[PDB]
């Protein structure tokens, strides 16, 4: 008080000193149920693939791509990534996901990698240098053990032109060893650009169905359309916290109310265009919003000449969120309530006044 008044001797009265404010302790994050899951189930166990070189591309759109099912299963065999860090895929949003898939054998899994080129570098699907993604190749010898050795996934081999990143090697050009073109069926040094499958289950361990679903990522200037789910904290009530709802962000308490919103109504606003009500994202409960307790601090002093003890008056604040006596204008901490009525000496508010009487102590 002496610092604010710039003096050493003050007289009787109530002086304004400062303005206190309660700070939020913790923060609460609330998000609704995780719905609209990305249909990644039909990518692994589904119908057969078209061909090796004729692989099908499946783009990704607005969905919830949960990664808690990819690196948490045992049906697969290879999960080697190339700088993806699957432990943090839930907190990373991408825009372009390439769900390439084709059929290979057990010995061709090694030849398909950005660090090991060769047979699959210019004859089939090639991998780029960066290749932000993980290879998903599992042993498909569960029910792909048909008799006769059906050769339908004929992969194109001995091709001259190198294959481009994320492309297909579709070219009906016969293999020419460096002579006149035959333009027929295996003429003068001619070979049809097709190789015969037929890796029967009684052929070998390396020659088995190993359908691989290549997965990669790519970032662009477009907004994030595909990303993993989010987390959610526990609900707290009757405490000045910082709520972090899906559409709302601010501070204030979160108590219960008797208001009833419409099925589609989610937010809540008052006449002064201020947020005062919020709906719970997970459950169905209208949570009231009320700003935390604030206000200025006032002191009641009887003058430094008589004595030096003073009191405090937190105006407009309840005595729980801060001897103590709840008045109609705050909580006068540092004074006793006497039933005897006297003349008003120091005005406080709503009729209550203070004075320095008898042992000497501030009375209200």
């Amino acid at each position: 008080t002496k610092c604010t008044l710039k003096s050493f001797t003050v007289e009787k009265g109530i002086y304004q000193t400062s303005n206190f404010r309660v700070q939020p302790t913790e923060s609460i994050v609330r998000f609704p149920n995780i719905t609209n899951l990305c249909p990644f189930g039909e990518v692994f166990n589904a119908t057969r693939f078209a061909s090796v070189y004729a692989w099908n591309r499946k783009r990704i759109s607005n969905c919830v791509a949960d990664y808690s099912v990819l690196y948490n299963s045992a049906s697969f065999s290879t999960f080697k990534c190339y700088g993806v860090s699957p432990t943090k895929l839930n907190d990373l949003c991408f825009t372009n996901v390439y769900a390439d898939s084709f059929v290979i054998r057990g010995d061709e899994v090694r030849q398909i990698a950005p660090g090991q080129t060769g047979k699959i570098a210019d004859y089939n699907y090639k991998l780029p240098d960066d290749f932000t993604g993980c290879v998903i190749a599992w042993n498909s010898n569960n029910l792909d053990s048909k008799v006769g050795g059906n050769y339908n996934y004929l992969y194109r081999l001995f091709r001259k032109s190198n294959l481009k990143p994320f492309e297909r090697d579709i070219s009906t050009e016969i293999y020419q060893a460096g002579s006149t073109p035959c333009n027929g069926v295996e003429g003068f040094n001619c070979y049809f650009p097709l190789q015969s499958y037929g890796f029967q289950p009684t052929n070998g361990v390396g020659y088995q169905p190993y359908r691989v679903v290549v997965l990669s990522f790519e970032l662009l200037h477009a907004p994030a359309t595909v990303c993993g789910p989010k987390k959610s904290t526990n609900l707290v009530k009757n405490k000045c916290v910082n709520f972090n709802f899906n559409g709302l962000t601010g501070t204030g308490v979160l108590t219960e109310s008797n208001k009833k919103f419409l099925p589609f109504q989610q937010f809540g606003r008052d006449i002064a265009d201020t947020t005062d009500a919020v709906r719970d994202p997970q459950t169905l409960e209208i949570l009231d919003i009320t700003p935390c307790s604030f206000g200025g601090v006032s002191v009641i002093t009887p003058g430094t000449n008589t004595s030096n003890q003073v009191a405090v008056l937190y105006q407009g604040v309840n005595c729980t969120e801060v001897n103590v006596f709840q008045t109609r204008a705050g909580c006068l901490i540092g004074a006793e309530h006497v039933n005897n009525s006297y003349e008003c000496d120091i005005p406080i508010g709503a009729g209550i006044c203070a004075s320095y009487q008898t042992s000497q102590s501030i009375i209200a």
């Epitope: 808690s68 690196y71 948490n72 299963s73 045992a74 065999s77 290879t78 999960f79 080697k80 700088g83 860090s85 699957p86 432990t87 899994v109 090694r110 990698a113 660090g115 090991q116 042993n139």
Partner: antibody, heavy 119, light 112 residues
């Protein structure tokens, strides 16, 4: 923050066995796999068996396939490993460690159980 | 399937000496490679996992690379001091029958 403990055996004998219990606490024991790894005196590490979330699948190795029973109660957050017909080469210290993900390492290991067979 | 590893190795505080771990079947670039450290008289701990990267807490001196020449791996442990004299193991998921194969161990010590 994660501090795992395990006990439930100080001495065994051929024929009569016990059940090792690994108390899971600290972290969230509802989204991680579990597996046992034993260590023989003067040797390296050996993978004993694995276990699913609650009751999905119980993967065993071909060495102890038929004489070891693993279990996991997701309700009380505990890991039980009961033995039966202990052989002679089973003299090794068993360790309890949670699995971050099926294609990753183990985050926190246990403390070790001195389980030895001696006449 | 078995994971080969040198039995013992010793040197003086100075340059780094990597530890090799050569496989026997399959490919090394098909799964991750982890390196554990077991202090004598306590429980093992993970030092480096996904050798292309490194976790927090452990100093950046412990490095490792991938050698796809003959399905092997290397753990270039730099900064040989007294607080690093311990044992190390090799581990890599190779078994298609849901089996985790481990290494043999090492005896990396110092010269004092």
């Amino acid at each position: 923050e994660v501090q795992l403990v395990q006990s439930g055996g100080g001495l065994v004998q051929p024929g009569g066995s016990l059940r090792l219990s690994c108390a899971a606490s600290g972290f969230t024991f509802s989204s991680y796999w579990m597996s046992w790894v034993r260590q023989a005196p003067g040797k390296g590490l050996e993978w004993v068996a694995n276990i699913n979330q609650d009751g999905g699948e119980k993967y065993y190795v071909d060495s102890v396939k038929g004489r070891f029973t693993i279990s996991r109660d997701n309700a009380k957050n505990s890991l039980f490993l009961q033995m039966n017909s202990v052989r002679a080469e089973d003299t090794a210290v068993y360790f309890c460690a949670r699995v971050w993900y099926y294609y990753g390492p183990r985050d926190y290991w246990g403390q070790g159980t001195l389980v030895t067979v001696s006449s | 399937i078995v994971m080969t590893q040198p039995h013992s190795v010793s040197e003086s505080p100075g340059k780094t000496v990597t530890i090799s771990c050569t496989r026997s079947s399959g490919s090394i670039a098909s799964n991750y490679v982890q390196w554990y450290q077991q202090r004598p008289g306590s429980s093992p701990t993970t030092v480096i996992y996904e050798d292309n990267q490194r976790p927090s807490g452990v100093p950046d001196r412990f490095s490792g690379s991938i050698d796809s020449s003959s399905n092997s791996a290397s753990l270039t442990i730099s900064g040989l001091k007294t607080e690093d004299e311990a044992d190390y193991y090799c581990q890599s998921y190779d078994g298609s029958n849901h089996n985790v194969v481990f290494g043999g161990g090492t005896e990396l010590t110092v010269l004092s």
